[PDB]
Amino acid sequence: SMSYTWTGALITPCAAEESKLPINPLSNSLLRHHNMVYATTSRSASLRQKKVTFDRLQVLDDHYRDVLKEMKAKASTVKAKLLSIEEACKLTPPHSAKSKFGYGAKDVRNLSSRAVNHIRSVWEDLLEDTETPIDTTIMAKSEVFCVQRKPARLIVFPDLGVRVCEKMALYDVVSTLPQAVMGSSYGFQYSPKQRVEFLVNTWKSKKCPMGFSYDTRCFDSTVTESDIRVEESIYQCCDLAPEARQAIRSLTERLYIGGPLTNSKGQNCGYRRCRASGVLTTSCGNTLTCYLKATAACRAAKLQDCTMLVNGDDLVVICESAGTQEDAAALRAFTEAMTRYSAPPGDPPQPEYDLELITSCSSNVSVAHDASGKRVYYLTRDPTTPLARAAWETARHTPINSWLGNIIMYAPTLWARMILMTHFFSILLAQEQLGKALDCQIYGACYSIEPLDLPQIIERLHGLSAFTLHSYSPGEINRVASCLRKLGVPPLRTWRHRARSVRAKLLSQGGRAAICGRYLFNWAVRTKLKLTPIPAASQLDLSGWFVAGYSGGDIYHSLSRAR
Ligand SMILES: Nc1cc(Cn2c(C(=O)O)c(-n3c(=O)[nH]c4cscc4c3=O)c3cc(C(F)(F)F)ccc32)ccn1
């Protein structure tokens, strides 16, 4: 069947759209080549529609069926709870898209009578009605990139009332089932330090390792109605409350398998027969589907001792080599099996014999040295996209701050420490906003974080070595330096000068600012301050941070204020 059918109505914006980076003094201090930075808009939506619209041909075999049964036997150990309305309302982001039924995200979080009444009625409708397709809105996503232009990605989501009901029925399932099924292969259970540890240990556990990343082109579009029903068959192995079992059954048939598409003007836009990017099950379902297809394909290809690391559609495979010619033919057989399963590649996969040459979740393992000179492995990436997005976020207030999420996840990197920490701490200190909570996302979930709490968060996610790394690899240094020339970012010597200045001001303020000065900026001086475990680090409640993926799932994980 076709992934989409279109009526001809356009994918429309709901307000004015900006595509060009503004010429602003604060963003210009970071990045001077503003014309290289752009944001996608609904103007390129038709280009994206063409790429995501195609017929799927799926052929399943015995390897696929055997893997499915093994996955279902693991899912059969799970007991999942139904969330109460209050618990589901607390998980709603403060700025989640308002309902078309006269209430918004603030009303949901406050348990307003109108919000609660509508949610109760949507819930009863899922219990009673197993067939009526649920309406979805289709919008073009606004994302920032550097030139060499990508068309806008498309987001498809149901009304706010439906989203709260999805959490009641499935929040506990999507949060616990993936690790029960995939074990150590489920990527979202790891902090960045645990992810590097798993990759390094897996690589070194093989007698002769071979690894590859597998990129599926337009993954959401490759997901069939059969894949979505198979995903439900896994969820159905859980012990569930009867209302949850009915709501999952109704959500699968009325929403997850497909449905009508409506634009921002209320016009009928088309029909979807593939994965919706903006539903609670998107990350869990994509992870399960990608793992199932890859595990079965590994057996069809005769790849030896395949260890997967899966995060939604992102897949990395580490296995036992059989020699270069054998591995090359086995990888082609893996690709042919994935294609039969309706997961064709974007870029054809390449066998790799060095762990540092593999790119997974846009990142690669690199090496630096700690204070004692000991080798430390860490995850880095090309800093182009993070710097272009940090420049945009400096010139325009955006709801989600990728710069903050990049500092958290990429804290040990030369670019996050020297550029991002230096730039944002300087601006925030000058605006007296170091203590102001800002939103960021970790594995798709939204968090409200104060920049002053960064040292203890970094210590927990990466260890104290994140504040002591030096002697970065020449390859890493060259990649950063070349990206700065390309974007017109001032050189690292300038960032070291700016860091010494903000560090002195942070130290002069005492308290939490001085902890930021001491730990975050120790790299900028020869006269190093002594770095001991931060007391607040052991008291940090990071439950929920690295449990599961929630991209498109409309999840908020920061504490709810009492009433
Ligand atoms: N492409 C992907 C990435 C992922 C998982 N994922 C995400 C994510 O946004 O979900 C990261 N991440 C965040 O969780 N918050 C963020 C805020 S701004 C940038 C990120 C970011 O990269 C992230 C960082 C790393 C590390 F390498 F750092 F370990 C590894 C995997 C990561 C799965 C599938 N495709």
From Swiss-Prot:
The modification Phosphoserine is found at residues 29, 42. It is a single-pass type IV membrane protein. Changing residue 400 to V: In strain: Isolate pCV-J4L2S. Activity is up-regulated by PRK2/PKN2-mediated phosphorylation. It catalyses: RNA(n) + a ribonucleoside 5'-triphosphate = RNA(n+1) + diphosphate. Residues 209-327 form the RdRp catalytic domain. It is found in: Host cytoplasm; Host endoplasmic reticulum membrane. Mg(2+) 2 binds at residues 215, 313-314. Its cofactor is Mg(2+). The N-terminus is phosphorylated by host PRK2/PKN2. Binds 2 magnesium ion that constitute a dinuclear catalytic metal center. Homooligomer. Interacts with non-structural protein 5A. Interacts with host VAPB. Interacts with host PRK2/PKN2. Interacts with host HNRNPA1 and SEPT6; these interactions facilitate viral replication. Part of the replication complex composed of NS2, NS3, NS4A, NS4B, NS5A and the RNA-directed RNA polymerase. RNA-dependent RNA polymerase that performs primer-template recognition and RNA synthesis during viral replication. Initiates RNA transcription/replication at a flavin adenine dinucleotide (FAD), resulting in a 5'- FAD cap on viral RNAs. In this way, recognition of viral 5' RNA by host pattern recognition receptors can be bypassed, thereby evading activation of antiviral pathways. This is RNA-directed RNA polymerase. It comes from Hepatitis C virus genotype 1b (strain HC-J4) (HCV). The lineage of its organism: Viruses, Riboviria, Orthornavirae, Kitrinoviricota, Flasuviricetes. The chain holds residues 2420 to 2987 of 3010 of the full protein.
